[PDB]
């Protein structure tokens, strides 16, 4: 993965995760907030815990990219809603919640 380097918030994956250009119920933080552990609403849909080493070892880097693109159930699809380059930056955000 090409990890994102800190920079201008207008180009940042965190501004997108925080809902820029999305309705609230399609913003990553609405379901995967609380530092990646999941929110009340997210948990009701069954979000995993991004901070859990157990969860992180259940997926490869490529599977993270593929599942953000395609969605699955209550997890919306994001292909066409952000660039392939932003999705890859986003896979790094997902990975980073488990890094101390």
């Amino acid at each position: 993965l090409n990890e994102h380097t800190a920079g201008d918030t207008t180009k940042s994956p965190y501004t997108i995760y925080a809902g820029l250009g999305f309705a609230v119920q399609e913003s990553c933080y609405y379901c995967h907030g609380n530092g990646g552990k999941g929110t009340t609403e997210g948990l009701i849909f069954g979000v995993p815990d991004f901070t859990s080493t157990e969860f992180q070892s259940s997926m490869t880097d490529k599977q993270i990219i593929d599942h953000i693109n395609k969605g699955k159930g209550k997890m919306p699809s994001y292909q066409g809603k952000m660039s392939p380059e932003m999705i890859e930056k986003m896979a790094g955000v997902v990975r980073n919640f488990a890094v101390k």
Binding site: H4, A6, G7, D8, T9, T10, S12, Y14, T15, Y17, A18, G19, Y29, Y30, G33, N34, G35, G36, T39, T40, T51, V93, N96, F97, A98, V99, K100
Partner: protein, 111 residues
């Protein structure tokens, strides 16, 4: 070792000091000076968090993006470029909010 809330208050006071001057037309040296002092305070906040508050890698990079804009505000105050001070303050405000929304999602927080 500072706490999270303490660091947050250490950034809040210069933040509002910064905010009060972004909508001016002015170039007062004492104001340009207060701006660079406020920017240095906010930067010290991110460096102090790194030194003492370990959470995860995203937490750290989010602080870096606050620091990115804070340093740009310092650079723009020095060049007496207040259009740029304004734009960088707006983007720094987004950087504060990104972390708030991601790590304290179910609570309303300033800015």
């Amino acid at each position: 070792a500072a706490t999270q809330q303490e660091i947050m208050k250490n950034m809040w006071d210069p933040f509002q000091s910064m905010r009060a001057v972004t909508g001016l037309m002015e170039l007062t040296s004492g104001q340009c000076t207060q701006l660079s002092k406020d920017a240095a305070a906010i930067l010290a906040g991110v460096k102090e968090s790194h030194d003492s508050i370990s959470v995860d890698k995203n937490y750290k990079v989010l602080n870096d993006e606050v620091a990115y804009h804070a340093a740009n505000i310092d650079a723009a105050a020095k060049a007496n470029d207040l259009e740029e001070v304004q734009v960088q303050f707006r983007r720094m405000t987004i950087a504060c909010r990104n972390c708030h929304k991601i790590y304290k999602t179910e609570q309303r927080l300033v800015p």
